[PDB]
């Protein structure tokens, strides 16, 4: 089996503690959690009750579950560095193997290395926006505090045309434009 003793801290941009949690689980079952109003561990069944009572007898824990102030002091040294953290994306446009389309050409605008995960992507053919497509893309986490996505544009090539990928992200002041043209 696997067991947990998980604590969570809900803090706002300012590092202000908004909520705090302390729950126990066994076999991926949330059994008991700290009830602030009742100031004691309450079941969330026999095991759950035995565990809330077993922990309710330890005054050390009872006085510790100061939960909101702990969240504050503990995170204080770094919280600001985290909520102010950003890293601009890198974007490139190149052709890719077309799929789910009748068009002979498919562009791929790659956006990687950005943080936070929120980003929006739109296309512009000769300066004019195109197509109902979700501009607020979902992103794949790299696990190192950077993300990546891609937007695809199906089209029929015309040598004079110029397609532009427009990426907008908080990590960058101005929108990022990447042009592409047949050949």
């Amino acid at each position: 089996f696997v067991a947990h003793v998980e604590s969570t801290c809900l803090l706002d941009d300012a590092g202000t503690p908004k909520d705090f949690t302390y729950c126990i689980s066994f076999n991926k079952d949330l059994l008991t959690c700290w009830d602030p109003e009742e100031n004691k561990m309450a079941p969330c069944n026999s095991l759950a009750n035995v565990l809330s009572q077993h922990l309710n007898q330890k005054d050390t824990l009872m006085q510790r579950l100061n939960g909101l102030q702990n969240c504050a002091t503990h995170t204080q040294p770094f919280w600001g560095s985290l909520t102010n953290r950003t890293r601009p994306p890198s974007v490139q446009v190149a052709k890719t193997t077309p799929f789910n389309t009748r068009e002979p050409v498919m562009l791929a605008c790659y956006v990687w290395g950005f943080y936070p995960a929120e980003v929006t992507i739109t296309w512009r053919k000769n300066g004019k926006l195109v197509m109902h497509s979700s501009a607020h893309k979902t992103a794949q986490p790299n696990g190192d505090w950077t993300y990546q996505t891609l937007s695809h544009l199906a089209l029929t090539p015309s040598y004079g045309d110029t397609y532009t990928c427009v990426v907008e992200h908080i990590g960058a002041p101005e929108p990022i434009l990447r042009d592409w043209t047949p050949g």
Binding site: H4, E6, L10, D13, D29
Partner: protein, 184 residues
């Protein structure tokens, strides 16, 4: 003013690691606790400054967690043990460009219990080096992992991520081939 969550997950099990601790800011890992050296290890260099926090509760949580694994044998064979098949996803950190240094990423989700080994193969042959594998708890009492492998992509390449849900519970493979590379 948005609200963010700081996760502090102490978990333990019948198996290795017998006990672990993971901390995350929103969805990203901040530290993982090394229980041999008994210290917090930063996921990134920039967090190294706060991995020496000592006012940290952990011992109590750690001990209570293990007590459950050792005392609560009473459940063995009575209730079905929770188990999730690991799901491996493989992709590259940056967009493909032959001859240009990159790094392969193998994201493992749905891992449960959190017992795993991840091996890399190049054309059905074990890789020459290796990279780090960071396991972390995610909201919902579940686990995940990220294994990395620095490398330089070449057209004939074929790599595979072999994730074994230890010990021999289940084995998953994920292939990666260079397709739609970028011009140089």
């Amino acid at each position: 003013l948005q609200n963010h969550t700081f996760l502090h997950t102490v978990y333990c099990q019948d198996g290795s690691p017998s006990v672990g601790l993971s901390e995350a800011y929103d969805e990203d890992q901040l530290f993982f606790f090394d229980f041999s050296q008994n210290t917090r290890v930063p996921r990134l260099p920039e967090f190294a400054d706060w991995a020496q926090e000592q006012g940290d509760a952990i011992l109590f949580d750690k001990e209570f967690c293990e007590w459950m694994i050792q005392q609560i044998p009473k459940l063995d064979g009575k209730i079905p043990v929770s188990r999730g098949f690991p799901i491996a996803e493989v992709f590259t950190l940056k967009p493909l460009e032959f001859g240009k240094p990159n790094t392969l990423v193998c994201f493992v989700s749905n891992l449960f219990p959190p017992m795993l080994t991840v091996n890399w193969h190049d054309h059905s042959v074990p890789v020459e080096g290796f990279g780090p594998t960071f396991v972390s708890a995610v909201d919902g009492l579940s686990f995940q992992a990220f294994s990395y492998l620095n490398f330089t992509p070449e057209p004939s390449d074929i790599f595979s991520c072999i994730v074994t849900h230890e010990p021999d519970r289940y084995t998953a493979i994920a292939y990666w081939v260079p397709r739609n590379a970028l011009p140089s």
